[PDB]
């Protein structure tokens, strides 16, 4: 369930890179490439696409989340002022059409409160990382699985992680 073999108290947790968020998958758009051509899409992480997503709790407000994450893990406020690019390339096979679309990936962080081997409270922070492309070859009129286009729940495209440090009191 939400059961964890840890002592009582609060913890910062890094849950790994590679998270993608529900509903948001196609909002950057995609490319259609055809017949041997190569499509390249990328982006540039700066300023106002590097603003993180906070999900606070009664115990853990935004500043508490920011300050504990930035102490133990990467200081995203300093890092994300400096533009980093990323690109993906796909090549369409001959006499076929390929659609490729781009979305951002995030590091997921959590502040958890543990009581009697149980997580009773959890705050979440998603910090923009890089990106991820999905592609499909298609025919005219071919029906495509909804799942290819649209994500119902947040997931990690890599292996999830659970890297923790106990938080000590002011």
């Amino acid at each position: 369930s939400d059961t964890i073999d840890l002592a009582d108290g609060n913890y910062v947790v890094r849950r790994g890179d590679g998270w993608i968020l529900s509903r948001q998958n196609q909002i950057l758009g995609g490319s259609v490439i055809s017949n041997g051509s190569t499509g390249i899409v990328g982006d540039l992480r700066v300023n106002d696409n590097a603003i993180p997503y906070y999900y606070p709790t009664p115990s853990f407000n935004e500043e508490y989340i920011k300050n504990n994450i930035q102490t133990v893990f990467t200081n995203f406020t300093e890092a994300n002022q400096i533009p980093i690019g990323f690109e993906f390339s796909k090549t369409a096979p001959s006499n076929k059409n390929l659609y490729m679309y781009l979305q951002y990936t995030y590091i997921r962080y959590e502040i958890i409160k543990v009581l009697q081997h149980e997580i009773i409270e959890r705050a979440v922070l998603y910090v923009p990382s890089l990106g991820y492309v999905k592609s499909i070859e298609f025919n005219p009129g071919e029906k495509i699985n909804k799942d290819f286009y649209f994500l119902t729940n947040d997931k990690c495209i890599l292996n999830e992680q659970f890297l923790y440090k106990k938080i000590l009191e002011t």
Binding site: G30, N35, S37, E142, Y149
Partner: protein, 421 residues
Amino acid sequence: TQRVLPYSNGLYVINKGDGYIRTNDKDLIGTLLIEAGSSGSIIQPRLRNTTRPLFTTSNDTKFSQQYTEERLKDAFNVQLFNTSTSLFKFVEEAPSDKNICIKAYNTYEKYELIDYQNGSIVNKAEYYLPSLGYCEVTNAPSPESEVVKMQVAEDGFIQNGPEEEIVVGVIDPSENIQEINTAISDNYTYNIPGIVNNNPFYILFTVNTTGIYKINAQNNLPSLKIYEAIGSGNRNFQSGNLCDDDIKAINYITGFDSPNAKSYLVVLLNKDKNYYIRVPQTSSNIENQIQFKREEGDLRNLMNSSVNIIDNLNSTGAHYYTRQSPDVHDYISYEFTIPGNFNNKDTSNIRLYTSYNQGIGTLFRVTETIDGYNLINIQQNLHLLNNTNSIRLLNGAIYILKVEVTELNNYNIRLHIDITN
């Protein structure tokens, strides 16, 4: 030959796919003639961030561009409409044999916003969000064929991306969202507050334990609807409490739009999810309460559906009841009492059928004990469409018919209950 759209009344944003271009080369970026052996590239480097969305609406004063954008953000979290930092670029190496042409086009992802009300679209807007391009490659043109003149096409769009129809309900922003801050256990009574009088409103709540719940207003009036907040519960969490993530993207579960119909909801609710109840415009000044109850007994067999209370069944003869039809594989239920005195002997012949939609029915005998409601399955696999089969039921006894829709031929479902004796 129109598809029946069995959508519940409300707003929907539909992603109609990517790779749209206008007719008559309006979105042509240009063509490269690449000689054999060589390569060419067309590049969108975002040296300027500006993009040009296209917009049309049937109603400037409700579905303005601003409003529509707010809806696309509710549905899909789109936040950049005028700008983009996303680069795209197309590269083609011509084979050793022949020359090659690449034509690159700007593209759009097409979103449709609709207000769907009682079986038709009453407001519509189309938002074409700038996308990441289309590249077609072709063999080099020969001399000269010859040029044949052509009239221009009508204005419009052509889709070059794959087929796509993603339908996402969105909260109506003109309506208040009230919250039940404590997570619901076995029982809960929500008093309807005067801060939201008369106007329809939403109630956001969540549940402590995954389970089947019965939900209704006082005396089952008005009828209610329930939605799931898409992607809720994946994030922040507090034991026994609601965590509101401001998710306005909603999946309709069950419930009727007609507020004078008596009904209650029986629904499977997940503890790791948030739900919205919509209570409609009520034309009465009396106080009402929404009741929530965890079901542990036979009422669980009715998930997920609204159960219509049928009240006017007190003579023999023909009777019919019209409601919005559920979509294929979804359920609607009816609770009715056979007219006459219950004396455990007097009986009546009952014929149950639909007019246009095919549905599979199961019939339950209902008895209320001190342990709750008991449901005895007395009839399975009823094929309702123009059913001529009839069954003898007890006068004064109570029955629930649960119907799964399997063929959707009409926006409404009409249940007939014909009673002879």
